[PDB]
Amino acid sequence: TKYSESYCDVLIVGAGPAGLMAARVLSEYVRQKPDLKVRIIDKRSTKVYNGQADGLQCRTLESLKNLGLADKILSEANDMSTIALYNPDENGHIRRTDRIPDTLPGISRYHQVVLHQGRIERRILDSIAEISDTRIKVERPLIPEKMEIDSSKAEDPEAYPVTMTLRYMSEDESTPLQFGHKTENGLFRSNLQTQEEEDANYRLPEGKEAGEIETVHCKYVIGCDGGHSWVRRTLGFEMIGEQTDYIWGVLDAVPASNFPDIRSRCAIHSAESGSIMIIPRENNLVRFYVQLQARVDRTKFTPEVVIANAKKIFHPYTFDVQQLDWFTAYHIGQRVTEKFSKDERVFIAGDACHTHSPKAGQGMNTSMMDTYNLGWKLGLVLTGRAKRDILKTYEEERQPFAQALIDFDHQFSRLFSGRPAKDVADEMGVSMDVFKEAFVKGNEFASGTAINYDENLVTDKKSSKQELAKNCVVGTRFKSQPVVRHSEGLWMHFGDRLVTDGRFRIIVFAGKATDATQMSRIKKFAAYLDSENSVISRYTPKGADRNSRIDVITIHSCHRDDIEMHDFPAPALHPKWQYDFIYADCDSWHHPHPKSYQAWGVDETKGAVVVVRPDGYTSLVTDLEGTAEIDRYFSGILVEPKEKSGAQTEADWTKS
Template sequence: MQYYKSGFRGGSPDVKPAAPDRRPRDGFAALPDQVDVLIAGCGPAGLCLAAQLAQFPEIDTLIVEPKPGPIEKGQADGVNTRTMEMFQAFGFGEQVKRESYWVNQTAFWAPDAANADHITRIGRVQDVPEGSSEMPHTLLNQARVHELFLEVMKNAPTRLQPSYGWALRDLQIDPDTEDHPVTVTLENTGVNAGELKTIRANFVVGCDGARSNVRRAIGGEMHGDAAHQAWGVMDILANTDFPDIRQKCLVASANEGNMLILPREGGYLFRLYVELDKLNPEERVAERNFTADDMIAAANRILQPYMIDVKELVWWSIYEIGHRLTDRFDNVPAGQDRDPRVFTAGDACHTHSPKAGQGMNVSMQDSFNLGWKLAQVFKGRSAPSLLRSYSAERRAEAKRLIETDHQWARIMSAPPGQSELDGSDMPRFQKQFIENLEFTGGLAVKYEGSALIGPPTHQALAPGFEIGCRFHSAPVVRVADAMQMQLGHLAEADGRWRIFAFAGADSGAGSPLYDLAAWLAEDPHSVLRRYTPADADIDAVIDLRAIFQQSFDVLLDQQVPALLRPKTGPFGLQDHEKIFCVDHKGAGDIFEMRGVDRASGCMVVVRPDQYVAHVLPLEAHQALSAFFDGIFLPAQSG
């Protein structure tokens, strides 16, 4: 972590210097008449987006929420490995690792062949496949995740805080103006209930849930189906003789239904997803009047010969499985050639079962995709047409999520008699779980070729950094201080692009890596000189890092290009943290782990949301320029 660049100051380095002209954000501040971005909803998607935009003082962001304050318990709890990688970029990944339950193993229970009324353990699998991520799969109360995002917002230069007690009721878009064309009507849900407030915005993002008013206002419709199956979920403090209660378990009984057990943070709390009854095609789950006692009784029937003695019911809910996807993620109908002004994210555009643990994760990945694009447009780095890519990228991924979760939910609700798949002795739910591990880890996302995703022409130079997929981190050593670390952890949620330059066998003066650094720093047509404002730090837009094959002690005395030790900030302080080498201390060789060509090296271009945008030879200066020309506008001062 780097700080003091602008001068020494005491206190937590997580608290950024406040922007001098920021708008008041406390609970008594009046709502503004106009904003740049209005976010509706303080769920995971809304708070993730707000935490990104809060870093940019030039963007006036307002986030509203109908509830009177933050949630305190319940709702989603699964944080997959991809989301943990994203949390690291926001600065609280290590905190989540410390507080959360780590899902290391998943156990499978099915009817005992000797006594079908009883269940028995039939298998166990490592929950996160070896080498798939440096981060664990964790479980943590959604309210705590919200709190961590709120802290990031409060500590950001804008000191952004939600405006609670306001619900978005409607919006209209004026097609004849570019100046705050979206007019939003908010309704007070608190002390002055019913009071209306009109605000004009440049952009609106609906993170307002499955019954989204934003989606309705732009004509979006949800399409899909329901499984007609009632499930209950509860967080409980309880005693039990079930031996795997502190491990994630998938349980299938012979006649009483299925259950999912998820241990929770803190060592005592755990969550149960309990299958209840089938519903008639026209029946809604609310009509059955299920209670918490119904769930507890069903759980005890499923667990026979074991039992659960509930001491405290912390939170519970009854739900019906449904899989629905909106026909649009923004306000522009298919086939129209114009830039969007209104977007939806999270449950506002896709809903699915909670048992695959994807709801909160995919919602945050939606807004993480959108946030840096909004910032890039507001900072004048890209044309507004960049925002068209949000719907193109995220709707395709949501469609795949719905299809996979649809299949998984039906397998989880299938009776054990239908458990064999393709003649295998392994029960269907166990086999499907193993096959889905990449998906449930959030690691199956792959964006297709576009202006933001280059062609795979040179993928062979680094097959382990797959173009269109998230940057798969690996261990390195920082040369300046011999610090062992993960290369991917250099990425912050700060809107910057990154170029990781891997040196080839020739890595001295005059080598391709040195020539690349010289071109970037000196050529007026290079991507750094073309897109970095003249009064900004050289790494303010695109951050170059170099990775060598030698050990750090060999590199300490080597002369390196000035761009790899740039002088930045108001004092022109030298940055010593741009140069890395392979980890010779035993954690792994990044060149070997990711298949980087040792002879020629390469550069890996990474987007602000941690996805690999391109892989190119170190000498491919013009190809790099051509790629960024399709995304960036020439730099403006300031």
């Protein structure tokens, strides 16, 4: 056995969706500060497909767009579009009673889509490689065997309070079981697997000696290690929830069926044989979640068994498989922890914190959104740009969301798994009216766009004048609306401008800038920005671009024929030879006036100022005179650079 010892800033344990998103987010900070050492490990080989998800929801897609990942995924993914609801009639034959939209109209410019998890990961990995310049690479197969946390060093910025002992595994150890089935399957990582079996399966066998045992001193550790999280259990964080006896199977197949809505998302409640959810996929595939009749013996859980019950559920429609790519099984159950962090030094995220059914395809989404939230906070802390206290907001924001997810799924999964009521007198059965209602309501939650974080160090409701941007509620995501880029008149979704890279934004709704009184207010605000002690002047390092830490963007309510970019303060709002700063809420060649001030709830004449966090959540709403509020908001979060930019000293480049 080789014994080794090293140091690192962050160790990410697990390279599924949560871990990969953590690495992608952190990659930006490593690029800015190359001596940062971020490592990510995984215990499984890649020889057996190590995935199971396919759905990406609206907010996840908005976030992926801001990471440069959405368009590539969308090039392949399938938009299921419709959810068709089938349930039994008089004679117990299922038929379509209703259709509802798969994405609620107006909720986001992105619709939910589905795509093989491996393809989604490949896109994220490519982005990690690009942003990190190939320096962040998944290390496998490695597995922690010991974690020691020195709580007395939690607040020391120079300390490595977390000692992780890692074992370098052999290929055999890292290979998951397949249970004798010829078709590739996810039984090994289903919740049919116990946590004891999980541990035992990857252990160093009796007799053999480990290749290498590495002692890694870490500033921070993120447990992204799944439902049976070794990190969570080592932390001693209990999970609450119980598993039911409901059992479902999953088939990723190219179907041969005369079912009319085989290519639509569908919920089917059969009279007595269970339910099905149809998730139509890319490349002629369709995924079928098929409820089965009822520990279950995994070697006996075959595709044939799943297919048999599916045919029953589809009756009298036919159902056959032309090709079967993969399958799995799972029980219906919910679990969630109360704690997401020990000392704000070891964090857990994703399935490690919350498990539930796939009826609303929420897990990968939530898990990635957990580390999208944690990652910028840790990134700013590690680069000496933010106060460590911001890390407390990860649990404060993400844990209540996990509880809500579990509560939502607890009801939805049971309604989906129950026998449909025959009439109003069938008390034991599930009401199909109630089910539809739960589905429609659930679609708002499932979108991921309705989150409203409670007041905290990075979310300032108390100092806000919310009425000034009524539809930019502090604590919720800043919603994209169409705008016209002033420079050439390009109509575009403003959300595309909020590239996630560690910067906060100050969105200056400049209002009716052609009005002299209003322009006087805009000028005074710019004079504040240019002042020696403004947030721009004190949080931008000397020599750095003044939009590189806080990105100050102006959206006015005038038509571009009526005012020029150079009529705005330069360079405070109109930076030198740069053209991605001034946007207009106005009519354009190919689109009508988008009424985007109105959609944002901002007065067209007077405007407002809205601060947005690096993860795209609104954190403060004030007026152009509210510079003290802006100042205090940032004082509570950011750390002054050793040498600051200080007062804006450049002459107006539009004259010169």
